Structure 1
Amino acid sequence: PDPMKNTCKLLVVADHRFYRYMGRGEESTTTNYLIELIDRVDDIYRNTAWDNAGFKGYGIQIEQIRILKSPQEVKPGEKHYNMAKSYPNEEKDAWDVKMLLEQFSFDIAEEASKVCLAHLFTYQDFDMGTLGLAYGGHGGVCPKAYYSPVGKKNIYLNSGLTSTKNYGKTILTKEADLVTTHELGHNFGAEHDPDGLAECAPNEDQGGKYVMYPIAVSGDHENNKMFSQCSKQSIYKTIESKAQECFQERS
């Protein structure tokens, strides 16, 4: 491990929904929530031995927090991830998750090119219990250009998002930590843990599921906060390939 190239710096964005419903319309409350969450998620990453040996001490650090206090004014037929209305169905509380991630990546392209990852924190009730989305596991850590034919410019796939609202209520902080861990897990290169690999998807008596399980099943079992051997193997290759590219020294 290179201690000079072990941290993935983050651009953290809180939208107007997050600022209002999680930040109680205050900058201090918004930022304190995000600062503590990322630090707790960083403890999971930094304490993980990706090769089950000495390849550890890799994590994340906030470089900047962009706080969007109010909705983005849009011209007719124009869209933006921070606009007041959901897209494609404005009658719904939330965007289609995949479209929101594409939109966020488009709008944040200039800033995303200068950071290891960009993460959007929102407060919207996605359909069928979805809590987040991210690129990787193409995309993930270190900006990789994608020419958007619709958008007519390069966008970067070093992005992900977390919503702290599910089924009409604010999720617990212990649950939000797992969402962000999981989405950043995809950014770091991990796929979902499959049922066919018992080592990677244990029973409840064996400590439960690991963080990369596709379903936010529990939140109270030991393994829930940890990466499976399947995730470690995938992430191990990514860090080996990407740390030199965009990782920095821990501040």
Structure 2
Amino acid sequence: PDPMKNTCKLLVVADHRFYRYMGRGEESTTTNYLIELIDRVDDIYRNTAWDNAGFKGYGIQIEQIRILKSPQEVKPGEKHYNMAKSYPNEEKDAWDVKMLLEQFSFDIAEEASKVCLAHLFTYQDFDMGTLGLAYGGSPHGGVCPKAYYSPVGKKNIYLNSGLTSTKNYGKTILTKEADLVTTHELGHNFGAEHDPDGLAECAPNEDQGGKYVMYPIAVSGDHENNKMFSQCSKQSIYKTIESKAQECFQERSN
């Protein structure tokens, strides 16, 4: 490992929904929630030995927290990830999750080009229990901005993005649950795919510690393995870090 290239700096964005519902309409409350969450997530990553030996000390740190205190004003027919209404159905509490991730990536493109990852934190009830979405680790995108020319958007957007909502089924998720969602979405950014049932090593039974963080289902969160990465995730992320650290990782701060 290269201590001068072992940290993925993040642009963290709190939309107006997050500001109001999680942040109590305050910069301090909003930021303190995110600072602490990212730090707990960083503990998982930083202590992980990707090759099961010395390849460790790789993690994440916040470069900037953008705080959107009010909805984004838009013209008719125009959309923005921070606009007041949900899209495509304004009668729903939330956007279609995939469309939101794409919109966020479009709107945040110039800023995203300057950081390892950009992550949106919002407060909306996605349909059917969905909690987050991210590019990378999909059967592209992930760490370090990679351009994608959007025919619809008419400009380059970058696929180094993901999002977490802290609302599910009409209530605020537990902080221990939020940590897991963000760890999982950034896991995809870092190159991990979902742990498949067919590999017991990567998807253990409850008596053996339970599932690892990259399992595709989220329920409970009280088992030992739940907060950690499986050997399958480690192998994928290891390869990702090896190819990407020199490209956009930086020295750990503080």
Same fold (TM over 0.5): yes
Post-superposition offset of 1:136:
0.1
Q: Does 2:236 match 1:234? A: yes
Post-superposition offset of 1:218:
2.1
1:36-92 Cα deviation digits (max 9, x unpaired): 000000000000000000000000000000000000001000000000000011000
Post-superposition offset of 1:13:
0.2
Q: Is the 8 A contact 1:132 1:163 kept in 2?
A: yes
1:170-205 Cα deviation digits (max 9, x unpaired): 000000000000000000000001011111111100
1:227-250 Cα deviation digits (max 9, x unpaired): 000000000000000000000000
- Using the alignment, how far apart are the partners of 2:6 and 2:192 within structure 1? 18
- Using the alignment, how far apart are the partners of 1:206 and 1:98 within structure 2? 34
- Using the alignment, how far apart are the partners of 2:197 and 2:48 within structure 1? 22
- Using the alignment, how far apart are the partners of 1:217 and 1:3 within structure 2? 36
Q: Is the 8 A contact 1:218 1:224 kept in 2?
A: no
SS in structure 1 of the partner of residue 32 of structure 2:
helix
- Using the alignment, how far apart are the partners of 1:79 and 1:200 within structure 2? 40
Post-superposition offset of 1:212:
0.3
- Using the alignment, how far apart are the partners of 2:125 and 2:233 within structure 1? 27
SS in structure 2 of the partner of residue 92 of structure 1:
coil
- Using the alignment, how far apart are the partners of 1:98 and 1:191 within structure 2? 17
Identity %: 100
5+ residue gaps, structure 1? none
Alignment-derived partner of residue 174 in structure 1: 176
5+ residue gaps, structure 2? none
The alignment's TM-score, normalised by the length of structure 2, stands at: 0.98
SS in structure 1 of the partner of residue 55 of structure 2:
coil
- Using the alignment, how far apart are the partners of 1:196 and 1:87 within structure 2? 37
Q: Is the 8 A contact 1:101 1:161 kept in 2?
A: yes
SS in structure 1 of the partner of residue 210 of structure 2:
coil
Post-superposition offset of 1:14:
0.1
